[PDB]
Amino acid sequence: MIQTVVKRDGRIVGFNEQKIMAAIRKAMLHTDKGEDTTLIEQITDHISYRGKSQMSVEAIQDAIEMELMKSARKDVAQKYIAYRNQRNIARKAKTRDVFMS
Amino acid sequence: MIQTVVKRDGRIVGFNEQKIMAAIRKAMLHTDKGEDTTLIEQITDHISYRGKSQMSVEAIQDAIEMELMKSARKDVAQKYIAYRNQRNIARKAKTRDVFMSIVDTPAGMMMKFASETTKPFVDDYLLSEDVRDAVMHNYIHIHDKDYYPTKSLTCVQHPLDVILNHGFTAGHGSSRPAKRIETAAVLACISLETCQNEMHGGQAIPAFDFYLAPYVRMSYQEEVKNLEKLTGEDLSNLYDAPIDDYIEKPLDGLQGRERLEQHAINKTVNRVHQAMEAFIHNMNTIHSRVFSSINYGTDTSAEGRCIMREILQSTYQGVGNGETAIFPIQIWKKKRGVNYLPEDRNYDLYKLACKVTARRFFPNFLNLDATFNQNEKWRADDPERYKWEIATMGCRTRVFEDRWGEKTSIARGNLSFSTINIVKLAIECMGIENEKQRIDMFFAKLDNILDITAKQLDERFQFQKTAMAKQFPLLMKYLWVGAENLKPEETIESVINHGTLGIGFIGLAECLVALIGKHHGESEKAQELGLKIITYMRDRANEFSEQYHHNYSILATPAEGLSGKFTKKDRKQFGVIPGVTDRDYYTNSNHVPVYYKCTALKKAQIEAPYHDLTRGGHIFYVEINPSVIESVVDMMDKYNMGYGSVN
Ligand SMILES: Nc1ncnc2c1ncn2[C@H]1C[C@H](O)[C@@H](COP(=O)(O)OP(=O)(O)OP(=O)(O)O)O1
Ligand SMILES: Nc1ncnc2c1ncn2[C@H]1C[C@H](O)[C@@H](COP(=O)(O)OP(=O)(O)OP(=O)(O)O)O1
Ligand SMILES: Nc1ncnc2c1ncn2[C@H]1C[C@H](O)[C@@H](COP(=O)(O)OP(=O)(O)OP(=O)(O)O)O1
Ligand SMILES: Nc1ncnc2c1ncn2[C@H]1C[C@H](O)[C@@H](COP(=O)(O)OP(=O)(O)OP(=O)(O)O)O1
Ligand SMILES: Nc1ncnc2c1ncn2[C@H]1C[C@H](O)[C@@H](COP(=O)(O)OP(=O)(O)OP(=O)(O)O)O1
Ligand SMILES: [Mg+2]
């Protein structure tokens, strides 16, 4: 499994998979079909395996994106990618630097 | 196959297979590995077959994405989807506000951008854990949180005499002391506008008539001097000659050195009228381009009366072609022994004030006779007695008392104020059928929420100091109590502990209905319980003030930015309850609900005994001929009403 997760800042934390569940549930909540709990627990189990001891947030995001494309519900993949790209674009602002200094 | 394609605008065009290929190719030329048409041909052939003989652009792009994220090349799909979404966002920005959703006048848009980019970062990185959790679950509202990183204060009462007597230097702009009535009003407007940018609240000028009184005599002297220059006479005895009043009289029928004693008064009145007419228009347009409040009424002199009767007749004609003026907010100061009784000095000014309030919504009325307002250091012969008369703002805020200083309302202001929701505190304990246990649990949770809000206010105070004096040019050099011994690069922590920390509440009729059968406006037991809980909060505030070495007060929140942001988040969690969460907006802090029909007398009688426990600020709003306003003021006099705003 995975024990070390390095966030965007560079810090190190554990591997609470409830984060993954909440992410892939909030993605589904904005679709048209609805929410199914048998796919969340399958994707989380498949990704809490075959990975490395230490993983980055970008790596886990990319893995979830790749696994969610080749699995039944594909109307969630477009929403997930669009929201992720929007937040990536919004992150490039210098708000953190000016806020902290 | 496919014969026709419908564009986004509405045009109908023939199907062109060389359009899908060139679109997939531009998404294959931005990845690590590109490709030739081996897969492009298969995708296009699959899309062309299995069609409806007429397709839209979006209906084709959906199929392109579905095919791309299905065949061995899932890296081109994630470049296609993102670019399509970016183009959609770009096209939606021609008539909408997409950029605000992601996070009309250009200045307003920039300010909204700043507020939205500042609020979450403060909510995360500056607040402590307990206060953050309390804020998240719809418990306490931190007013003006966007201005949190700017260690800013709320408001202040301007000592206009300093500026008018010595001049001011703010940046590279300096201004000398005034010498007439046409410059004092302009300088007052400049001071208000300048200090508005340095604070996130309103601006008020106490003793409006006293400050500008010395500049009515100067205009008279200048007119007399100019009048003696074309005649060669000697009018040196008229400079200090007492004047009963600056009333304008017709000039026909007189000759000699008593005829020119009236031309001067006439032109002085005209100039003062023009100055007071420009003040209103300036303070209205600047706001329409700033919360401005002026309080006056307790001056007995030929000059102060002239100012008070010119302002009260320029506020009568309105602005422009007769339109009413929204700003400035004008307040009348009524005292027993000055202008109240029919034989007092300024009864006619009070009559004019009552007349103007019946056409132009202003002025308001501040009662100086109340127990909490009276000051022992007041004597109606000192020319500087205005320092001991309480003044208020248009934002319903009072700062009079002090535990380490004088009991004045000049050069002091509010530091911060937060609001506590209690309707949820009542719904959360509505399940219990036994009243005693329900009340006990209510009080137990109220204690915890009060402790949390006190800790939050203390932490905001600790952050608001360590602010250099240079960050507030005008405020900490001329407009604050000890702001005359502070170096530009010195922390303001030596004078900051003179303000007020406000704890407010929103809704009490709802809380009692969620507690007992009815509200305070119908049942006596509910009124007693509400008075009990308000008194409990006041005693806890006194304990907090004694413990944290600060000043705490209880406020009736104006409900200007929190009218709705408490009931929707309670509907979404507790469901519709009859008479509690089924109205849209919660009722105000301690008022009478707008639907429970009452008369002015009953409403005043029930609402009066709360003003003694709401030292931080309170209002008496009555909805509706000078006689009606006279009756309202008399009703205020009969009880301990502090501030009234009948219209
Ligand atoms: N503790 C963790 N363990 C494993 N994966 C994590 C963890 N935290 C984040 N991730 C990964 C998987 C999540 O889908 C993705 C983003 O989750 P999330 O916690 O919302 O991000 P974040 O760090 O940006 O949070 P926030 O915006 O609340 O600060 O990052
Ligand atoms: N409404 C939604 N539609 C689609 N995906 C969503 C939605 N809400 C959340 N997600 C996804 C995006 C993230 O992977 C995760 C929640 O993390 P979130 O904090 O929203 O974004 P993020 O970690 O990518 O960005 P950031 O930290 O910059 O805000 O779930
Ligand atoms: N004439 C067409 N025949 C078939 N499909 C088309 C046609 N025009 C557009 N499409 C579909 C399939 C393409 O992959 C997708 C991209 O459209 P695109 O060629 O960029 O047109 P457009 O409407 O955006 O025009 P423009 O960008 O020139 O204003 O739209
Ligand atoms: N640089 C790129 N990266 C990834 N995919 C691209 C890129 N350029 C074009 N594409 C893909 C996705 C686009 O929908 C399609 C046609 O491009 P384009 O005409 O620019 O888009 P569009 O039709 O959404 O735009 P517009 O609304 O501005 O006309 O090809
Ligand atoms: N709109 C304004 N904004 C800022 N400062 C102003 C404005 N109008 C005038 N002033 C300044 C100019 C002077 O420095 C000061 C006082 O002006 P004024 O009453 O004309 O006196 P003064 O010192 O110029 O007298 P005199 O002209 O008789 O010598 O106010
Ligand atoms: Mg005019």
DSSP letters for B338-363: TTSSTTSTTHHHHHHHHHHTTTSS--
Assigned token pair, B9: 């605008």
Q: Is A3 on the interface with B (CB under 8 A)?
A: no
Exposure string of B617-639, with b = 16+ CB inside 10 Å and e = fewer, is bbbbebeeeeeebeebbebbbeb
What pairs with residue B203 in β-bridges? B156, B292
Q: Which two tokens stand for residue B73?
A: 């090349």
Cα–Cα distance measured from residue B209 to residue B294, given in angstroms and rounded to the nearest whole number:
10
- A98 touching B (Cβ < 8 Å): no
Confirm or reject contact between A72 and chain B (CB < 8 A): no
Neighbours of B215 (CB within 10 A): 21
* Inter-chain residue contact B85 with A85, CB threshold 8 Å: yes
What would the two tokens of residue B118 be? 């500042």
Q: Does A68 touch chain B (CB under 8 A)?
A: no
Report the C-alpha dihedral over residues B404, B409, B411, B416, rounded to 10 degrees.
Answer: 80
* A75 reaches B (C-beta below 8 A): no
Structure tokens at B139: 């418990």
Who among B102, B121, B149 is closest to A86 (CB)? B102
Q: What angle do CA B51, B53, B57 make, to 5 degrees?
A: 75
Task: Supply B529's token pair.
Answer: 């319980």
Neighbours of B485 (CB within 10 A): 8
Helix (H) or strand (E) holding B455: helix B435-464
B92: Cβ contacts below 8 Å, ≥ 6 apart: B98
Nearest-Cα distance to chain A for B330, in Å, is 40
Q: HSE on the CB side for B289, CA within 13 Å? A: 10
Distance from C-alpha of B229 to C-alpha of B225, rounded to nearest angstrom: 7
| Nearest-angstrom CA–CA distance, B380 and B344 | 13
Q: Helices A18-28 and A57-69, interaxial angle, to 10°?
A: 50
Q: Which residues contact A101 (CB under 8 A, 6 or more apart)?
A: none
Residue B30 CA, closest ligand 4 atom number: 3
Please list, residue by residue across B348-375, b when 16 or more beta carbons sit within 10 angstroms of its beta carbon and e when fewer do.
ebbebbbbbbbebbbbbbbbbbbeebeb
Ligand 4 atom nearest residue B8's Cα:
27
Residue partners of B331: CB distance under 8 A and separation at least 6 = B293, B294, B295, B296, B363, B364, B365, B366, B391, B392, B394
Tell me the C-alpha distance between B593 and B615, whole Å: 22
Question: Amino acid identity, residue B264?
Answer: A
Q: Which residue has tokens 């001929």?
A: B625
Q: Which residue type occupies B336?
A: R
The tokens for B181 are 């009535």
Q: Chain B partners of A78 at a C-beta cutoff of 8 Å?
A: 65, 81
Q: For residue B56, what are the β-bridge partners?
A: B6
Nearest CB to A95; choose among B82, B85, B121: B121
A99–B121 CB contact, under 8 Å: yes
CA distances from residue B513 to B339, B516, B537, B573 in whole angstroms, order as listed: 43, 5, 19, 18
Residue B546 CA from chain centroid, whole number: 29
**Contact indicator for B320, B355 with CB cutoff of 8 Å:** no
Residue whose CA is closest, atom 8 of ligand 1? A19
Helices A57-69, A75-91: inter-axial angle, 10-degree rounding: 160
Identify the three-state secondary structure at position B5.
strand
Give the span between the Cα atoms of B284 and B288, in whole angstroms: 6
Token reading at B381: 């012969």
Contact B78 A65 (CB under 8 A): yes
